[PDB]
Amino acid sequence: LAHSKMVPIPAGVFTMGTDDPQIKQDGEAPARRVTIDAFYMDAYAVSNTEFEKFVNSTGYLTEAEKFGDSFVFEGMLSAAAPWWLPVKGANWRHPEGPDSTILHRPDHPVLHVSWNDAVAYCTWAGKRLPTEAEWEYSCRGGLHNRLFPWGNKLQPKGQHYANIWQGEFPVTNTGEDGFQGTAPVDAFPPNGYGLYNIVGNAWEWTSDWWTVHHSVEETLNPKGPPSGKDRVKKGGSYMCHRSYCYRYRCAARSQNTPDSSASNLGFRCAADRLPTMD
Numbered sequence: 119l120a121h122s123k124m125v126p127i128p129a130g131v132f133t134m135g136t137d138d139p140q141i142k143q144d145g146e147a148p149a150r151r152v153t154i155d156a157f158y159m160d161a162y163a164v165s166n167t168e169f170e171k172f173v174n175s176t177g178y179l180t181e182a183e184k185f186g187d188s189f190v191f192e193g194m195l196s197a198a199a200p201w202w203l204p205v206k207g208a209n210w211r212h213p214e215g216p217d218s219t220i221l222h223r224p225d226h227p228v229l230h231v232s233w234n235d236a237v238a239y240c241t242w243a244g245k246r247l248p249t250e251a252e253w254e255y256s257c258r259g260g261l262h263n264r265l266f267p268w269g270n271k272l273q274p275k276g277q278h279y280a281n282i283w284q285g286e287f288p289v290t291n292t293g294e295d296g297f298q299g300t301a302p303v304d305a306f307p308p309n310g311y312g313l314y315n316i317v318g319n320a321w322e323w324t325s326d327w328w329t330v331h332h333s334v335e336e337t338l339n340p341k342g343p344p345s346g347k348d349r350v351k352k353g354g355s356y357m358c359h360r361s362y363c364y365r366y367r368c369a370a371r372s373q374n375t376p377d378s379s380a381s382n383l384g385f386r387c388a389a390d391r392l393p394t395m396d
């Protein structure tokens with residue numbers, strides 16, 4: 119009902135990255151101290167309904183619609199890996215291909231949106247993408263040097279805290295956490311700053327160009343490198359399992375070309391100040 123609401127992320131200093139990297143190729147290390155000015159972050163990833171308001175207002179055609187295909191995980195059917203298929207007619211309204219629909223999942227995160235699509239939405243909304251540092255600071259939710267937004271245990275108190283994979287990937291997803299594919303954007307507990315599904319569910323685009331080479335120097339509101347070929351995405355998705363993936367940590371990070379899209383990748387917006395009410 120308020121799926122475009124923002125929360126205030128307080129000013130602070132935090133440790134970005136980790137000196138105990140789990141996927142070393144991704145440049146999770148070194149840990150570095152980063153200062154972040156107070157700003158606002160969407161509580162929820164952008165949902166199908168919210169994206170549809172944007173498309174209704176602007177007529178925007180997404181990159182996947184213009185290309186005529188997008189990547190779909192083979193386990194969702196009725197490339198980076200054999201389980202990623204380029205499906206003709208897969209896009210945000212048709213997340214598994216032309217015979218699928220979003221009618222029954224209006225409150226789920228929008229998928230098959232490229233980095234350019236995400237920038238278009240956020241700017242239409244009076245907002246912007248978060249930087250990687252803003253995203254990671256917000257993900258950590260006021261905790262220092264923890265694996266997850268909520269701490270170091272995957273299932274605190276025996277409860278699922280995010281939508282990831284259980285079972286044997288890619289053949290069997292048991293749905294133990296309540297969701298095979300995506301969950302509603304307001305599912306699961308919030309983190310300490312009031313964000314929902316910051317890890318898991320679907321990946322989220324950030325504004326930074328990708329590099330794996332980071333300095334240990336302290337920085338203020340860093341924006342990432344001035345050039346690159348891929349943009350950074352964060353958080354992991356409903357596909358992720360410890361056995362092959364382990365990217366549902368705040369420090370984890372991956373990348374895609376900005377015209378890329380997939381069935382497990384969306385976004386949320388940020389803003390320096392609140393945009394106009396309504």
Ligand SMILES: *[C@@H]1O[C@H](CO)[C@@H](O[C@@H]2O[C@H](CO)[C@@H](O)[C@H](O)[C@H]2NC(C)=O)[C@H](O)[C@H]1NC(C)=O
Nearest residue numbers: 165166167168169170171172173174175221224
């Ligand atoms: C986006 O626009 C469509 C088309 O105007 C909206 O769907 C219509 O909503 C009205 C109002 O309830 C109905 O009378 C029509 O039958 C709907 N048409 C179709 C084709 O669904 C839709 O609700 C808008 N989406 C958002 C999120 O506002």
Ligand SMILES: [Ca+2]
Nearest residue numbers: 281282295297
């Ligand atoms: Ca799940």
Ligand SMILES: [Ca+2]
Nearest residue numbers: 315316320353
């Ligand atoms: Ca997420």
